[PDB]
Amino acid sequence: MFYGTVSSPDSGVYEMKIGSIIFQVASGDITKEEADVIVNSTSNSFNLKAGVSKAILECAGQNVERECSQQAQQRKNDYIITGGGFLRCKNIIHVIGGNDVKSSVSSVLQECEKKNYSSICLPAIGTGNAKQHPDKVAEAIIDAIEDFVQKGSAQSVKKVKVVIFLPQVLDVFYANMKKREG
Numbered sequence: 001m002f003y004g005t006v007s008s009p010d011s012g013v014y015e016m017k018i019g020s021i022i023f024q025v026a027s028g029d030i031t032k033e034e035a036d037v038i039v040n041s042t043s044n045s046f047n048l049k050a051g052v053s054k055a056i057l058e059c060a061g062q063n064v065e066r067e068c069s070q071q072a073q074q075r076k077n078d079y080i081i082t083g084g085g086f087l088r089c090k091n092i093i094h095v096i097g098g099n100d101v102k103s104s105v106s107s108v109l110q111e112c113e114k115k116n117y118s119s120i121c122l123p124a125i126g127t128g129n130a131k132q133h134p135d136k137v138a139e140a141i142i143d144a145i146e147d148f149v150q151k152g153s154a155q156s157v158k159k160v161k162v163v164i165f166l167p168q169v170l171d172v173f174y175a176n177m178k179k180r181e182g
């Protein structure tokens with residue numbers, strides 16, 4: 001109903017269409033990417049500095065760390081939106097790694113439409129300190145994008161890329177894409 005064909009447009013990058021969105025996966029350091037939004041997978045206190053969250057907070061800088069702690073004390077947040085600091089993005093969206101991954105991705109997509117953004121880059125949310133299983137995480141990320149497209153909600157969002165630290169996790173995402181392909 002929505003899925004195109006899986007191919008490789010560049011070395012180490014794999015892609016397929018999901019409605020009007022191009023969905024891509026690759027392995028690398030997410031802090032070197034450029035996108036309108038970069039997603040951080042963190043703790044419910046928004047101050048985890050371990051694995052991909054360490055890299056994101058160190059690169060983003062102390063003003064972003066300060067933004068995170070200020071918002072965390074103000075209210076009970078499922079996720080937080082901050083500036084990009086010294087990352088190459090307009091905003092960072094900090095999601096809780098232990099939360100339902102489909103719900104977290106749905107929220108990121110809706111916030112990006114609100115800002116008329118076109119590109120998103122995310123890690124394999126929940127596979128680090130939260131220790132969620134990689135194929136459940138891949139299934140949830142892709143399901144969220146399918147639902148967003150099915151509801152007619154994709155207008156400004158055109159590109160969603162997962163940059164994955166461990167090559168063995170990339171292999172799981174590629175197999176999930178092949179399961180779905182048209």
Ligand SMILES: Cn1ncc(Cl)c1C(=O)N1CCCCC1
Pocket residue numbers: 050051052127128165166
């Ligand atoms: C499990 N994991 N997924 C992404 C990242 Cl980053 C990590 C991580 O904790 N590290 C630190 C130890 C050396 C390998 C990378």
Ligand SMILES: [Cl-]
Pocket residue numbers: 041042097098125126127128129130131
């Ligand atoms: Cl995590």
Ligand SMILES: [Cl-]
Pocket residue numbers: 052123124125127163164165166
């Ligand atoms: Cl990752």
